[PDB]
């Protein structure tokens, strides 16, 4: 899903 991409970007940024 496209609307999940913006969440994946948050992961590797903060994880």
């Amino acid at each position, epitope marked *: *899903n*496209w*609307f*999940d991409i*913006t969440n994946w970007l*948050w992961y590797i*940024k903060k994880k």
Partner: antibody
Amino acid sequence: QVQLVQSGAEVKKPGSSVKVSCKASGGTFSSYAISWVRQAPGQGLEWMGGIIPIFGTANYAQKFQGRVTITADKSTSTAYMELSSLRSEDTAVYYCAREGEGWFGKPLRAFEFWGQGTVITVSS
Amino acid sequence: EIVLTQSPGTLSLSPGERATLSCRASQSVSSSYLAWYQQKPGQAPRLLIYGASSRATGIPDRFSGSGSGTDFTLTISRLEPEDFAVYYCQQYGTSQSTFGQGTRLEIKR
């Protein structure tokens, strides 16, 4: 917090093209998707497309493919919506929305932040 | 892709009464990716519920979301004069986001 300011109203002719801007203010700009939603007089909401500014690739609605170009200018923190081959049915209020920001940086997917809306009148 | 149908079309309720709006989907919505928005005349849509049931920031707890898959429900427990407007549902379980035709909630007198 996040604020979205759109450009003024516009009056276009059938067959021409129109371009609407959306200047964001506050928070992060690269890693948050900006979507565009139109609404005709008396009708309802309609999703047109979105873009994640950190990527040049966008995501358009299959109905509008061939007429919608959504590009983001990170240098000015401004999203752009462009519609070509205008027809009278395109006469609507064009809102620019941004996904919601939850606890910490974890983003939501619904449209929490919105602009004031641009009245695009396609007539002759 | 997914066609959302909102019910009923128009709803006439008095302040203090209980409100229930239904949003049915032609197919299953992935991960309950359903959102409810409110829009008043002349203004922009205001987010109420995201994730089918999670409440947005600054929204009173009298708004409650329920359901999943093909049927979702927005419930307004006690109605107030500032709760009468148009309500939309929106699915974002697929890359092609879509909205409902709208449910207007007016005042009964």
